[PDB]
Amino acid sequence: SRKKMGLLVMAYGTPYKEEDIERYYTHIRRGRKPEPEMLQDLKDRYEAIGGISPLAQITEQQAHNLEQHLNEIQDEITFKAYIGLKHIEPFIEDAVAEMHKDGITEAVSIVLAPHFSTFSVQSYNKRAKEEAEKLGGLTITSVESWYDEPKFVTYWVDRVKETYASMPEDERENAMLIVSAHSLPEKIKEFGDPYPDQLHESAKLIAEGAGVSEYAVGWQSEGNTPDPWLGPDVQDLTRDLFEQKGYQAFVYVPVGFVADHLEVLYDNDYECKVVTDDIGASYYRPEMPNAKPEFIDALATVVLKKLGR
Numbered sequence: 001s002r003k004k005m006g007l008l009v010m011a012y013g014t015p016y017k018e019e020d021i022e023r024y025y026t027h028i029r030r031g032r033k034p035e036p037e038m039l040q041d042l043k044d045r046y047e048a049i050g051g052i053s054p055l056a057q058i059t060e061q062q063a064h065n066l067e068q069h070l071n072e073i074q075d076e077i078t079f080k081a082y083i084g085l086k087h088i089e090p091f092i093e094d095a096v097a098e099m100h101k102d103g104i105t106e107a108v109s110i111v112l113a114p115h116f117s118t119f120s121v122q123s124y125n126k127r128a129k130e131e132a133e134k135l136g137g138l139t140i141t142s143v144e145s146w147y148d149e150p151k152f153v154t155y156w157v158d159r160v161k162e163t164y165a166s167m168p169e170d171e172r173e174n175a176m177l178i179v180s181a182h183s184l185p186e187k188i189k190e191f192g193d194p195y196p197d198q199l200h201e202s203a204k205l206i207a208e209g210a211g212v213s214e215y216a217v218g219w220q221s222e223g224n225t226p227d228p229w230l231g232p233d234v235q236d237l238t239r240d241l242f243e244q245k246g247y248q249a250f251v252y253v254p255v256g257f258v259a260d261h262l263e264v265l266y267d268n269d270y271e272c273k274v275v276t277d278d279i280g281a282s283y284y285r286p287e288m289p290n291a292k293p294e295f296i297d298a299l300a301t302v303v304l305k306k307l308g309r
């Protein structure tokens, strides 16, 4: 009775083992293999956050859980999840090829990043649809952004509320909320890319919902290319806000990210933490969505809304 549909889940990607680090970063750096010192640095970063292998399992678990949940919450469509990654196998084109091989003719895609950008989301979507057209007989409808899905906003609002609620009286009254996503080259502005606007909307929505009056928008994890790169970077923003107003606690909500990967566990929980430790402030970073039922239900709602269901 049910309509068979592909569920194409797209993400940045993460190495599966320490031995994947070289090729993963080469790919991110557009063919420029890291020198031995940087490679070792990277290995040490992964070791410090507790290993690489758990990290890559989250994306699999997200996709699996989302398929299962969508299949249970409605009765018209049977979804089959396929993972398509930007920087490591299974690549986006691999996933689309597999769907076509498997007799999928109709699919919905979603990127595990809630904000639209020309660099990330739009590129993934183009690549997916281009491989589908190349093979023929397979259409894909693509989610573009979902940062404003009420269930997703509520996820973050509730975590933020719990964080503040757990603070001592003096910290709660003198805290700063820093809402962040992955930095991108500043040149996206020439296309009128709404990515920066969507992050400030995300921050607005979360702060408003949590009853947080003092918040700021920051960027993190920028690459090293000759052009900038959206700023301010969270490290610089943290110190600057402290110098400006003396905040005693900083709460990091890397809303651009959906899971416990290197950008959060290292770029917040180490890099921002060094800064908060230095200035004498408490560090807080609520739990990432990961594969949690509340988050999977938000994603389910996003997918079905896109389908008009």
Ligand SMILES: Cc1c2[nH]c(c1CCC(=O)O)/C=c1\[nH]/c(c(C)c1CCC(=O)O)=C\c1[nH]c(c(S(=O)(=O)O)c1C)/C=c1\[nH]/c(c(S(=O)(=O)O)c1C)=C\2
Residues within 6 Å of the ligand: 025, 028, 029, 030, 032, 119, 120, 182, 183, 184, 185, 221, 222, 223, 224, 225, 226
């Ligand atoms: C060393 C290097 C990096 N990135 C590039 C280079 C070598 C080219 C040059 O600088 O002349 C180059 C690019 N990154 C780009 C683009 C459009 C280029 C130009 C490519 C060309 O035409 O040659 C985009 C880009 N890049 C990154 C992302 S994002 O993570 O999805 O946000 C995106 C969208 C990520 C990184 N690129 C990096 C690094 S890292 O310094 O940490 O090793 C990172 C974390 C480094």
Ligand SMILES: [Mg+2]
Residues within 6 Å of the ligand: 221, 222, 267
């Ligand atoms: Mg960095």
Ligand SMILES: [Mg+2]
Residues within 6 Å of the ligand: 225, 226, 227, 228, 229
């Ligand atoms: Mg620069």
